Paper text:
Cryo-EM analysis of E. coli RdrB showed an assembly of a rigid, higher-order complex, and we determined a structure to 2.1 Å. Structural analysis of the E. coli RdrB complex reveals three large insertions to the adenosine deaminase core that mediate higher order dodecameric assembly. Compared with a typical adenosine deaminase domain like Plasmodium vivax ADA (RMSD 2.4 Å),23 RdrB contains an N-terminal extension “insertion 1,” a unique “insertion 2” that divides the catalytic core, and an “insertion 3” after the final catalytic histidine H530. Insertions 1 and 2 form a 2-fold symmetrical interface that joins adjacent adenosine deaminase core domains. Insertion 3 forms a hydrophilic interface consisting of alternating glutamate and arginine residues that create a 3-fold symmetry axis and enable assembly of the large dodecameric shell. Some adenosine deaminases are known to function as dimers,24 but to the best of our knowledge, assembly of a large, shelled complex is a feature unique to RADAR RdrB. We made several mutations along the interfaces between RdrB protomers; charge disrupting mutations to the conserved glutamate residues that line interface 3 (E595R, E596R, and E597R) result in complete loss of anti-phage defense and demonstrate that RdrB complex assembly is essential for RADAR function. Instead, all the top hits with structural similarity to E. coli RdrB (Z score > 20) are adenosine or AMP deaminases that deaminate the adenosine within unphosphorylated or monophosphorylated monomeric substrates, as opposed to within RNA.
The RADAR system comprises two genes, rdrA that encodes a protein with an ATPase domain, and rdrB, encoding a predicted adenosine deaminase domain protein. RdrA and RdrB join to form a giant assembly up to 10 MDa, with RdrA docked as a funnel over the RdrB active site. Our results define ATP mononucleotide deamination as a determinant of RADAR immunity and reveal supramolecular assembly of a nucleotide-modifying machine as a mechanism of anti-phage defense.
Numbering used by the authors:
A (entry chain H), C (entry chain A): 1 to 309, 322 to 619, 631 to 708, 714 to 798
B (entry chain I): 533 to 619, 631 to 708, 714 to 798
């Protein structure tokens, strides 16, 4: 119940609107807590919550504390954090609950409270480090010996959401600019309403300003400096929404002096919080404690909004965010915790901005390396990508530090109202980005040793895999080894997701050792995929037809599923009959022929390095028997009627195919993946109540989770948790270890073997230059 | 409580649930009573006894030693009227306590129960709250307690009115099917309990007994694969239990 | 039978008392051999010995040798040592017998004889190295790749008993001083009588002087220098008991010139012995050969006495013994054989002496590192611990050299006649030692990176584990990570040992990854634990009562052992009735309550960093229901009657609990250890005839040794053999490999896997700073 006192829209609104001298707010904190719990965790049976709150008040009163942030943080810290061996750690039995808590609350206040009220031995000077891990000697020895490998890091840029809070406080007007430019977007209005109904850009700005002013005021009391006089005029937290306070005629600023040069750094935040809690060890003023409460609530609300989601990202285009990234991937020891790091970045449409981003990344990497090895660096102060590469050529893969492999993204956008063919403008923008990348690789061939892979992330439904095939082929020739493509993440139907993975396999130029992505559609079971879903799901006609064709293709040879294959064929022919407005008869065979040509470039021959796939259609048009597939595909691409019918929607039953048939399709795709030796980057992620239901365990082959006809698939690890603050590769490794040891009963050695196999898959299927 | 499985009872619940000390102590005594004779759950019975003695030590603010036996004696007297002799038709249970106070060996249970009823300190401690782990007892032990209560109910021929009702996603997870003995829902050591039907749906508008009968029939026929005849037999047994255990004058 | 001619009190007495010109001593050497064999190995059936001696004389006579040290050493060397690959090695089939021999005879004379009479190729200049190992390519490759890890080295200081002989010859008067100060002790008088009945300090001194004089004389003949004239006056070996010999009126000294600067070094000893045997290759003078025989006998007797056992140890407080220790742990190659070395030392009660010992250890380590890496050392000549730490901070854990982790001991002594509470004065002395350690760690925080662990060794029965809990807690806060405590080594009963291990588990602050010690009580089977034991064993009443309570606690829930649990409860209540002189009724429940409070500090509230456990009893005294346990524990601590009854003795049947019940208790403790992830350092050690009966194989899970309900327990290796000279971690690794391959039939690969798991446990549960 402690999370609802640190993350609550109702509590924030109430505390930020009433005066600072109201006193006696217990009734209201309680009511707001129940509202927050109903809004967030609805399934609590309405009396467990009452009892938990009663126990919380009982603990506070017995320990002679007041209901407030200090007491809540103390309780959380005593419950989760200790001291063991080196620095604070989390209980092994409590790590899962700690992760769930981290999805709502920031860890820095809790660690500050732990350092204040339960410090470790006074010989290990504690420097703040996120996140907090559990301790197990087997896991620590494995990490020391083999290190961890990162293959999936693309969520909030590549940094945890917790430094984004301080970045926003540093650039409040950049953050406000981004929020406004994106609040005009519907998606965003809906998200803001779903988190905080009455958010708006104006209260967003006011909350950021209130957080900044509260931070300044509480820094004053943390240092114990004289409580400036204008504090008396401060009566209502809304007064802090502004850059200055008016006491009597005068306008006083909230700024003060800070010890550290960077006052917005997490070290500075930790120092200020530790000082504040040390001063408030025994008690605190009610008003200032409420200010701290409001600051924590604002921070947690901002982090929730951020995790559930260009410019603030542009501000990560210096050799600072990347240097911190590499220092963080490296542990606190001499030898890095992370050996092979894949760094994913959005490719810019401006050659200048692209050169800019890449120079920043490479120079941050070089600085990180210079802080860990001493050598003749040629250019002691590199200024250009060429100089940075001259520096980096001297670095040997000894294994002491991280080894970087850069992977540009490709963001897929929804098709627009009017274009020559679907995703024409998107394919364009991708073309320009790829052109910029290829010109960079040309003008500097050595960049092929650091740019290893083109991943296409973003929403699945916005662009199919067949759209990126020409781009990936051209990049392969421009010198881009290894390809990645997000598949199976979000799908209108499980069959649709499996079909998407199969299309990616049979259309993308994925070679031996390549990696696909999440591939959730072939890991999630039909049993736990339809748990809160309506009995009928609506999809687009194009997806429906492609799914029917895929079902037919995969269940033709299945003696036990021939009925489903035949029904899929019949339905596919029918749906094609309207989608194409055909008067004649089209068989499932010719439908298959039509739909195997989706990998062709639209503007090849049916509508230097690009020449090959410009003429790739000529072979097709040469084959005398490929008439009707060709004309049908041209109708599929250009015909306005066919495009309207493609965007049309149709309903499909949830049990359209039985669990057995869906598992058969999943296992067919599994077999294809194993045959082509394609790995799956699986980070930990809606339908899972508990982490033990995750499909990673099915893929790893745990008894009770693996299905009879499953095939191993070379799972790799990735540090990408959509809804957590301050996650790490080590954190996810430890989470998997904890789940395996506690929920599946595996011994530490067996659990370590299972997690290590996935981790080593990261190294085996790395994109780094050998 | 005796129909819901431990598996689907802790699905969105916190790992620790807080209760009152009186409920905690009574639960520990009940666990001891029911798992004394279970050879496979003797450890849980012993731990329950030890925790019960401890919690009684503060709840009663006792300085002496109170055994689980005398705790059981104290807590078997909860059926006595408070204002009988320790605090026309009412005369019988006004004096029902006299037999207890006559038994020479019922001293310490009696005084302890009087403290439990009147002592302000004991009442404050009773209203106090304490945390209990969700997995305080394993699923096996919880099912054993459920089946013990089942056996008691079957022996005393007490029926259960089960209307359709938070932790169930789908109606097929309802405990009525476990009670009816459907394969995959019944547990090995279950005992039939004479379930009767009731038209009480907390969160529906315009429900009826016929509606609930048809809902049970539909679930049985479509989700459990039972033929119409078998499903009708299963629902009819519950419905007929309503007539067998009716309160109407014969 | 050859061992009885090199280690025999009777033979030594006879040879040292008769004149050097007696000649013809075969009858007497034979009779003394039979007496020595009866005294040492009694189970030889009185005719196998006759036949073995006959074969020995037959071999000597056929090979034209005389009964003497040269012939015996030649026979042993031909039988055990060869040349293979690099340097001399021991047969794999013969290594077990060689180890048993090393328990009686020193290896240096045998290696000298091998080098003289069967040298290897004349291209590998042989430098003497102890001990001799077998050769197996799998084991050598494993050692080269992973190295060996030492977690238990506390037996004779930390050096082999064989350098102690030369140390005694170097400091005869220090050794004599120690022997006298300790011969007043009964324990020691009994030990001396059991080894050599008529030893006394005076003959001890005379034997040391005789050894020194014989060494000088035989060095003269090894160099071939003119046999000084006073040799003629030397007629009776007792003449060498003195520093000078009187030829005619004059007193001549025995000293001569030695090639090497250190004449008491093992290199010097090897050179002298090799020269002597080379000169005596074909024959030897009878008198000088008898002098060599007497020297060998004296050395072996001294080593036997030493292994079966402060000042001579103080003399190991220079940066020489530790430098040799580290050089020896490092092999002869560039890369060290031993990776993670735990160094255990007795903490001194004088802050000066403690600083002294620690500076010596750290400077020896620094010198060892300087001899293997070249780097800017800041202080080229460190003089203080701070300077040595400045030097050591630059050392990276590359893996080339050993990595040191220091663990102070805590020696437990028997309680004395009069004190406030049992072990009050012992707890005191431990308190002062811990205070010195904490002040050291304060004044130099960097010492926490080298002092990792507080082990409490010494005799188990002299102090229970519950006495060290406050000390370990306070040290944990002072910055001492990792804790160790010897348990299960020696116990009045197997149930008592198992109970001691359980008490250590549930009272000591052992965290995840900590190690306990030998834990023999949970490894030794009840079958082979009562093999020569009386049918009734007597214990103290306190141990009896605690054992009964433990039996009840562990067999309450066992349906098949409820009878034993109930009988244990009844007997516990009865024994408590006298021990406490109670008139009222005390239940087993309240007995359990009383005995769970043994972890409380005695002088807390019932009799800076110490404040926590000074008030730890306040919570107990606050609990309203903890009356009778508290008063009973106070009686247990203070009451003179209860203390007398605690020291009283009572008899317990050997079959008090059946083998099944004892195994059930062992497996319960096993499960506790596995759950808490506590490792067991198991070195090789009274009831085992053959090494194949050792409990390490049961713990490793070998078929025929593991019991049905056993639980794996993370066994680590340790080089601690109580009754051998010149043992090593490599020697014990090879011994385990040999036993596994020859006696259990395991292939080299499987045996290597089994030994490697234990060795790797040493690294996983290392105390070294990460
Ligand atoms: Zn992703
Ligand atoms: Zn030991």
């Amino acid at each position: 119940m402690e999370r609802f006192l640190l993350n609550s829209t109702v509590l924030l609104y109430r505390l930020s609107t009433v005066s600072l001298d109201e006193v006696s707010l217990d009734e209201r904190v309680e009511s707001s807590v129940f509202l927050a719990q109903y809004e967030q965790a609805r399934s609590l049976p309405d009396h467990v919550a009452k009892s938990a709150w009663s126990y919380l008040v009982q603990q506070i009163k017995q320990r002679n504390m007041k209901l407030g942030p200090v007491a809540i943080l103390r309780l959380i810290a005593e419950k989760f954090i200790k001291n063991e061996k080196g620095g604070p750690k989390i209980d092994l039995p409590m790590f899962s609950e700690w992760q769930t808590l981290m999805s709502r609350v920031s860890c820095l206040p809790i660690i500050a409270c732990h350092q204040v009220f339960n410090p470790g031995p006074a010989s290990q000077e504690y420097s703040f480090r996120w996140p907090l891990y559990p301790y197990h000697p087997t896991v620590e020895d494995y990490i020391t010996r083999e290190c961890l490998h990162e293959t999936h890091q693309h969520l909030n840029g590549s940094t945890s959401a917790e430094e984004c809070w301080l970045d926003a406080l540093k650039h409040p007007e950049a953050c406000l600019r981004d929020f406004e430019k994106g609040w005009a977007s519907q998606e965003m209005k809906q998200l803001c309403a779903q988190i905080d109904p009455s958010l708006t850009p104006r209260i967003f700005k006011d909350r950021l300003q209130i957080a900044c002013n509260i931070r300044e005021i509480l820094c004053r009391v943390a240092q114990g400096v004289e409580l400036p006089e204008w504090i008396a005029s401060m009566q209502n937290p809304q007064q802090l929404a502004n850059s200055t306070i008016l006491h009597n005629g005068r306008e006083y600023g909230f700024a003060t002096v800070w010890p550290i040069d960077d006052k917005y750094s997490q070290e500075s935040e930790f120092c200020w919080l530790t000082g504040l809690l040390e001063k408030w060890r025994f008690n605190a003023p009610e008003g200032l404690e409420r200010l701290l409460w409001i600051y924590l609530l604002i921070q947690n609300q901002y982090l929730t909004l951020l995790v559930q989601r260009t410019m603030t990202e542009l501000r990560e285009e210096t050799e600072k965010s990347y240097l911190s990234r590499f220092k963080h991937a490296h542990g606190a020891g001499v030898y890095s915790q992370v050996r092979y790091l894949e760094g994913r970045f959005a490719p810019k449409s401006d050659p200048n901005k692209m050169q800019k981003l890449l120079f920043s990344v490479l120079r941050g990497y070089w600085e990180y390396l210079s802080a860990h090895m001493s050598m003749e660096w040629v250019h002691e102060k590199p200024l250009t990508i060429s100089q940075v590469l001259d520096n980096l050529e001297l670095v040997e893969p000894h294994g002491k530090c991280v080894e970087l492999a850069l992977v540009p993204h490709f963001i897929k956008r929804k098709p627009k109202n009017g274009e020559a063919y679907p995703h024409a403008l998107l394919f364009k923008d991708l073309k320009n980005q790829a052109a910029i990348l290829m010109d960079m690789l040309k003008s500097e061939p050595r960049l092929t040793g650091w740019i290893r892979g083109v991943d296409a992330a973003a929403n699945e439904m916005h662009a199919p895999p067949e759209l990126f095939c020409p781009l990936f082929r051209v990049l392969a020739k421009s010198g881009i080894a290894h390809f990645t493509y997000h598949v199976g993440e979000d799908f209108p139907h499980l069959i649709s997701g499996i079909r998407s993975i199969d299309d990616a396999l049979r259309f993308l130029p994925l070679r031996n050792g390549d990696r696909l992505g999440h591939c959730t559609a072939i890991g999630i079971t039909p049993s736990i995929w339809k748990r809160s879903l309506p009995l009928s799901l609506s999809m687009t006609k194009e997806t429906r037809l492609l799914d029917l064709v895929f079902i037919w293709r995969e269940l033709r040879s299945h003696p036990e599923l021939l009925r489903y294959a035949s029904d899929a064929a019949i339905e596919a022919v029918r749906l094609a009959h309207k989608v194409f407005s055909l008067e004649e008869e089209v068989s499932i065979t010719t439908l298959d022929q039509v739909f195997e040509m989706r990998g062709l470039l639209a503007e090849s021959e049916g509508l230097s390095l690009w020449l090959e796939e410009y003429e790739r259609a000529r072979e097709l048009v040469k084959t005398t028997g490929m008439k009707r597939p060709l004309k049908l595909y041209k109708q599929w691409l250009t015909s306005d009627n066919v495009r309207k019918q493609r965007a049309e929607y149709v309903e499909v039953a949830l049990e359209y195919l039985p669990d057995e048939a869906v598992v058969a399709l999943q296992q067919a795709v599994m077999a294809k993946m194993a045959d082509r030796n394609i790995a799956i980057e699986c980070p930990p992620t809606s339908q899972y109540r508990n982490v033990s239901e995750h499909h990673i365990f099915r893929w790893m082959g745990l008894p009770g989770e693996a299905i009879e006809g499953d095939v191993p698939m070379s799972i790799c690890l990735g540090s990408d948790d959509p809804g957590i603050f301050a996650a790490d590769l080590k954190s996810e490794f430890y989470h998997l270890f904890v789940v395996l040891t506690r929920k599946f009963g595996l011994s530490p050695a067996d659990a370590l073997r299972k997690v290590a196999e996935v981790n080593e898959n990261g190294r085996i299927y790395r994109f780094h230059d050998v």
